[PDB]
Write a protein that binds this DNA or RNA. Structure first.
Length: 915
DNA sequence: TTTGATTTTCTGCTGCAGGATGAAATCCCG
DNA sequence: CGGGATTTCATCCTGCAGCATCCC
RNA sequence: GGCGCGUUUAUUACUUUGGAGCCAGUCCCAGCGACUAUGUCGUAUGGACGAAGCGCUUAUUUAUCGGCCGAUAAGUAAAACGCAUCAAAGUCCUGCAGCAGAAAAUCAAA
């Protein structure tokens, strides 16, 4: 009773079905074409299939490769010419891609004391359902709907929604008029593609991508206006130099609002320089806290133009290895007159301070631990100092150029046969940087001028040599199918695709995807009704509005007609190709859009080099259950977390009364431990588990979304989440992005409660998360006041004591927090409260949640898991928001704040109905 | 011993923003 | 004189929302 | 960690997550550690090598044995069958940015 396809047949077999209004919910397949090895994987099983299915017919793959290459070159040439358009008129391109308005009418005016920005912003009140007053400016009414007052009512210069088809792409480049000199069908593709589906699909993809860039760039210009004003306010550190009278000036003038992309890098170099000076002279040398000398903020988030402005720094490996070796052997003989030179102490000071001698690597972890291959050279230098400082440098050079020529004769014999050693590259680069930072120390003590150019050259070469043998080439190539629809003529396929299903021998189909992108016909059709056991070839082409099947006559030929067979499981077919409830060839599910994706899948025998051809048809629903369900006895309190996500508590609607996804953080920390082991040695990633973390995350998210939906439907529930303000995370030092999934569970539960009919108003509500998961279920803290005294506090009611066990190690330490209080209190108490912060010990012991699993109240004396008690309050906070009793009227009229109103609601209900 | 602040090279995962194109109207060519 | 390939065109949503929640 | 069977997820073979089965050794090159230090000995850290179900049939091959066969321990070669071995999930694309991981430099701090 646990499956997700039993709950949907419980939902859609209880209440009625309504057609959708304007659009529907969208799903999609992700199937794979039978390339070749999907036929090898069938003649290796025990039980062999009866009919060997089909493959790509060896000339469909050639045409598909030609189409994908020509499509990617066309899309790149269009984004090139619009990049050269965008680099001249930012506001010109922004005003070009604005939108049409719609088909409105005669609106008002507002030219009186209001224009636009950088041209006569009128006004109207269209949507009279609830919220009206959309601006809708003009000059083709560019819907300039914006402004949030704050400083001044500044409506946006271009629109609020950039659009896809605002440009009318197909009167420019593609058509045979329009002397704009870059026509991608007549120049690059070679005039052999139809100007029907290719031009419109290329319009779809290129205008979608440039509208994405512009609609991000507008918001980023506004946010940098705020951040540049805030950065100009934080040049009160120019006061802090005379506030301490010991620092002269940082001497850096901030450029204005940058607008381009290189202005951002210049302004960020200036903010980086002032931030480096602030950390060097005001957080360490004078020991100020961070909120006394606030740092300058960096301009983050500037979007670049999509495909034209990638990085492309690709270099070979062996040329940079020989370059590093040339730079090292150029400075050898001047590197002898320094190390056989200066003193007996300055050589020891350079060895000691610049991290050469082994500081503490002697802790045998049940052999000594490994060294970072700069201190191996320190051990060798110490031993060759002991047994043997003039002739030591020659004696410690020959045992490195035998460890470099020993490694470089191990790569070059194990790279140029078949394999990649993948660790003996990283140890060669580590040893070359150690020998580099050993030769160059004549420069970093004698004259520091040409050191930093040589140091930035060695840093660029080390970066190339460490990362570049692990970069991925071969980005994904894709070609759009923009719909299946019979045109205005009676029998002609617009957009030139189908979904074939050639009939097989017994009764079954084979589900091909015919593309016909050549500049001819070769696919035509009349109609069909019989199931004759051969190539009936039926088709599904949406004649007009209603769906239809046809019968289709064509010969598989070597001039067009890319015929891809599909290979999907029985589960994808049972869901949405031949489903019993929403049947195709009737109209309840319509197809909308297809692709052909050639992306990289990891093959088990070799590395990741295996491009396979996915298809990904996108399906829209058109039958949807109507809401006549209320779910009374409901109040399921989902209360999300990170150590154990989505802990559940169920309760009756008066208030009176599971650990879904139990072991998840341990698996993710083990996968990150495996990546951090294969990153310390062997500098890259070993790209097998470069897609393990997202796959495990999606498996847990969709399994727990199934479990929440099952517990919502069967126990007749209304899921009450907590308003975690989408995009919530720890965002600290050791948070990997996979463990940041409080938004994705709500997203998947909504996107499975949008499909199968409902909305986010009948099985998914949301309460406030303010002061939940902090109040005990028999008590009511917020303000830990140590105003009362250092022998005791008074807590809520009654009193308390002291005598503690305060644990705040950050090494291996603790206290007792009575002796600590006395030592930081002496015999004055109040003066110690004014000077020192003794509240840290109070909030280290007397705080709730001592270990980050449990929970102890301060007036109850209670102990519950703080997740099965974070859930019985989320369900009791939604029953406080929308239940107008007495104490929701208060905090709404403004008598009491939220904490006092909620505790006066709780301690009124916790004795009456245990709510 | 370990962490502040800049910087060089790679990677993955989430979080936004475009989307999920049919109907009609010309026009050329056998 | 129709068949079939090009070439234009154009759509729509309101909804209200308050200072912790995650974890260290 | 590696290698394979594969069942349930109410016409097919995809992408995955779980449970169960079988192997995890050799200093050949390297890494790393100790030193009796331009190398010797250890350590399986990476490459390269080999290890990777069982059982019932049938054609064989080695050896025992009952007077040209036939039963046996073991291997080869072939197809079907049973067991170990059982449950779940899928909404994509393009484009950026943001975080986080990783070393490696430079200036400093406790």
């Amino acid at each position: 009773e646990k499956r997700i396809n039993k709950i949907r047949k419980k939902l859609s077999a209880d209440n009625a079905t309504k057609p959708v209004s304007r659009s529907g919910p969208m799903k999609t397949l992700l199937v794979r074409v039978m390339t070749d090895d999907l036929k090898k994987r069938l003649e290796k099983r025990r039980k062999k299939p009866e009919v060997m299915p089909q493959v790509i017919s060896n000339n469909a793959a050639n045409n598909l490769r030609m189409l994908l290459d020509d499509y990617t070159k066309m899309k790149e040439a269009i984004l090139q010419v619009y990049w050269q358009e965008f680099k001249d008129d930012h506001v010109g391109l922004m005003c070009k891609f604005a939108q049409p308005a719609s088909x409105x009418x005669x609106x008002x005016x507002x030219x009186x004391x209001x224009x636009x920005x950088x041209x006569x912003x009128x006004x109207x009140x269209x949507x009279x359902x609830x919220x009206x007053x959309x601006x809708x400016x003009x000059x083709x009414x560019x819907x300039x709907x914006x402004x949030x007052x704050x400083x001044x009512x500044x409506x946006x210069x271009x629109x609020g929604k950039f659009g896809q088809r605002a440009l009318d792409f197909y009167s420019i480049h593609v058509t045979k008029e329009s002397t704009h000199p870059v026509k991608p069908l007549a120049q690059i593709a070679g005039n052999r593609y139809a100007s029907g589906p290719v031009g419109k699909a290329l319009s779809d993809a290129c205008m979608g991508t440039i509208a994405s860039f512009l609609s991000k760039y507008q918001d980023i210009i506004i946010e940098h206006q705020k951040v540049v004003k805030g950065n100009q306010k934080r040049l009160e550190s120019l006061r802090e130099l005379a506030g301490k009278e010991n620092l002269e000036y940082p001497s850096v003038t901030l450029p204005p609002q940058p607008h381009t992309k290189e202005g951002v890098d210049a302004y960020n170099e200036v903010i980086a320089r002032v931030r480096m000076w602030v950390n060097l002279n005001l957080w360490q040398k004078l020991k100020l806290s961070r909120d006394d000398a606030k740092p300058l903020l960096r301009l983050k988030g500037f979007p670049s133009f999509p495909v034209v402005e990638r990085r492309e720094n690709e270099v070979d490996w062996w040329n940079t290895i020989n370059e590093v070796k040339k730079l090292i052997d150029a400075k050898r003989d001047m590197g002898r007159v320094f190390w056989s030179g200066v003193t007996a102490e300055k050589r020891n000071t350079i060895l000691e301070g610049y991290n050469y001698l082994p500081n503490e690597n002697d802790h045998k972890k049940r052999e000594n631990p490994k060294k970072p291959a700069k201190r191996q050279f320190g051990d060798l230098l110490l031993y060759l100092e002991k047994k043997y400082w003039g002739k030591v440098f020659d004696e410690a050079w020959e045992r490195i150029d035998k460890k470099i020529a020993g490694l470089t004769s191990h790569i070059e014999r194990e790279e140029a046969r078949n394999a990649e050693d993948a660790q003996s590259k990283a140890v060669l680069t580590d040893w070359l940087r150690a020998k580099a930072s050993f030769v160059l120390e004549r420069l970093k003590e004698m004259d520091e001028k040409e050191f930093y150019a040589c140091e930035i050259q060695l840093q660029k070469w080390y970066g190339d040599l460490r990362g570049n043998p692990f970069a991925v080439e071969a980005e994904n190539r894709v070609v759009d199918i923009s719909g299946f629809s019979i045109g205005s003529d009676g029998h002609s396929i617009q957009y030139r695709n189908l979904l074939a299903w050639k009939y097989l021998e017994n009764g079954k189909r084979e589900f091909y995807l015919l593309m016909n992108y050549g500049k001819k016909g070769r696919i035509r059709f009349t109609d069909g009704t019989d199931i004759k056991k051969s190539g009936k070839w039926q088709g599904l082409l949406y004649g007009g509005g209603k769906a239809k099947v046809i019968d289709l006559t064509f010969d598989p030929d070597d001039e067009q007609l890319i015929i891809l067979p599909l290979a999907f499981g029985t589960r994808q077919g049972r869901e949405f190709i031949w489903n019993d409830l929403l049947s195709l060839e009737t109209g309840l599910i319509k197809l909308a859009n297809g692709r052909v994706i050639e992306k990289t899948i990891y093959n088990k025998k070799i590395g990741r080099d295996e491009p396979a051809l996915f298809v990904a048809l996108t399906f829209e629903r058109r039958e949807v259950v109507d809401p006549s369900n209320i779910k009374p006895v409901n109040l399921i309190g989902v209360a999300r977390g990170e150590n154990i996500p989505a802990v559940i508590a169920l309760t009756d609607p008066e208030g009176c009364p599971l650990r879904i996804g139990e072991g998840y953080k341990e698996k993710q920390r083990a996968i990150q431990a495996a990546k951090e082991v294969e990153q310390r040695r062997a500098g890259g990633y070993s790209r097998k588990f470069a897609s393990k973390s997202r796959n495990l995350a999606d498996d847990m998210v969709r399994n727990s979304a199934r479990d929440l939906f099952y517990h919502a439907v069967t126990h007749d529930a209304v899921l009450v989440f907590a308003n975690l303000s989408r995009g919530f995370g720890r965002q600290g030092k050791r948070t990997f992005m996979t463990e940041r999934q409080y938004t994705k569970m709500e997203d998947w539960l909504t996107a499975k409660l949008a499909y199968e009919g409902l909305t986010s108003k009948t099985y998914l509500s949301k309460t406030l998360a303010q002061y939940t998961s902090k109040t005990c279920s028999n008590c009511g803290x917020x303000x830990x006041x140590x105003x009362x005294x250092x022998x005791x506090x008074x807590x809520x009611x009654x009193x308390x004591x002291x005598x503690x066990x305060x644990x705040x190690x950050x090494x291996x330490x603790x206290x007792x927090x009575x002796x600590x209080x006395x030592x930081x209190x002496x015999x004055x108490x109040x003066x110690x409260x004014x000077x020192x912060x003794x509240x840290x010990x109070x909030x280290x012991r007397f705080s709730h949640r001592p270990v980050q699993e449990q929970f102890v109240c301060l007036d109850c004396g209670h102990e519950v898991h703080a997740a099965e008690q974070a859930a019985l309050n989320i369900a009791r906070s939604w029953l406080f928001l929308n239940s107008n009793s007495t104490e929701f009227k208060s905090y709404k009229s403004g008598k009491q704040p939220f904490v006092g109103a909620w505790q006066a609601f709780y301690k009124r209900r916790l004795k009456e109905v245990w709510k």
